[PDB]
Amino acid sequence: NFLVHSSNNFGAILSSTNVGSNTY
Amino acid sequence: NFLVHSSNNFGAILSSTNVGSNTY
Amino acid sequence: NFLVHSSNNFGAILSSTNVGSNTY
Amino acid sequence: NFLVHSSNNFGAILSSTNVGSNTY
Amino acid sequence: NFLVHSSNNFGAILSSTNVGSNTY
Amino acid sequence: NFLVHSSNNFGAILSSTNVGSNTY
Amino acid sequence: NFLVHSSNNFGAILSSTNVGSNTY
Amino acid sequence: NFLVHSSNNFGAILSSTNVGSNTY
Amino acid sequence: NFLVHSSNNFGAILSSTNVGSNTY
Amino acid sequence: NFLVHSSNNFGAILSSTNVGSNTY
């Protein structure tokens, strides 16, 4: 479990339920 | 379990339920 | 289990239920 | 189980239920 | 189980139930 | 030129020159 | 030129030159 | 030129030159 | 040129030159 | 040129040159 410069996400939405859910 | 610069995702939405679900 | 610069996904939506599900 | 720069998917939606399912 | 730069899929939707299933 | 929900392509790479062209 | 919910592409790479072109 | 909810692309990389072009 | 909720792209990288181009 | 809630991109990198270009 050696992790050098890992877990990279760029410009991310992560662990998200409703994205843009509008006009109800 | 040696991970150098891994788990790369770019511009990502990850673990997401409803994307753009609109006008209900 | 040696992973150099692996698990790359670009511009991804991953683990996602409803994409664009609109106008209900 | 030696993985150099593997598991590449680009522009992907992966593990996804309904894609574009609209106008219900 | 030596995998150099394998498991490549590009522009993919993978493990997906309903693609484009619309107008119900 | 009436187009209702047309021009659908799913999981597509379109207008593309070299796909997977590797190991030169 | 009436377009209702057209031009749909999902999980797409479009207008792209070299996809995965690696190891030169 | 009436466009209701058109030009939808999901999880896309679009207008892109080199995708994943690595290890030169 | 009437556009209701158009030009939707989700999780996108768009107008992009080199994606993931690494290890030179 | 009537645009109601248009030009939606979520989690996006847009107009971008080099994404993740590392280890030179």
UniProtKB/Swiss-Prot annotation, chains A, B, C, D, E, F, G, H, I, J:
Chain's gene name: IAPP
Residues shown, of full length: 47 to 70 of 89
MF terms in GO: amyloid-beta binding; hormone activity; identical protein binding; lipid binding; receptor ligand activity; signaling receptor binding
Gene Ontology cellular-component annotations: extracellular region; extracellular space; neuronal cell body
Other noteworthy facts: IAPP is the peptide subunit of amyloid found in pancreatic islets of type 2 diabetic patients and in insulinomas.
Biological function: Amylin/IAPP is a glucoregulatory peptide hormone that plays an important role in the regulation of energy homeostasis. Selectively inhibits insulin-stimulated glucose utilization and glycogen deposition in muscle, while not affecting adipocyte glucose metabolism. IAPP function is mediated by the CALCR-RAMPs (AMYRs) receptor complexes. Amylin can also bind CALCR receptor in the absence of RAMPs, although it is more selective for AMYRs.
Modified residues (Tyrosine amide): Y24
Family according to the record: Belongs to the calcitonin family.
Organism listed in the record: Homo sapiens
Keyword Disulfide bond applies: yes
Written domain comment of the UniProt record: The mature protein is largely unstructured in the absence of a cognate ligand, and has a strong tendency to form fibrillar aggregates. Homodimerization may be the first step of amyloid formation.
Highest taxon above the source species: Eukaryota
GO biological process: amylin receptor 1 signaling pathway; amylin receptor 2 signaling pathway; amylin receptor 3 signaling pathway; amylin receptor signaling pathway; apoptotic process; bone resorption; cell-cell signaling; eating behavior
Keywords from the named record: Amidation, Amyloid, Cleavage on pair of basic residues, Disulfide bond, Hormone, Secreted, Signal
Protein name: Islet amyloid polypeptide
Subunit field text: Can form homodimers. Interacts with IDE and INS. Interaction with INS inhibits homodimerization and fibril formation.
Post-translation changes: Amyloid fibrils are degraded by insulin-degrading enzyme IDE.
Compartmental location: Secreted
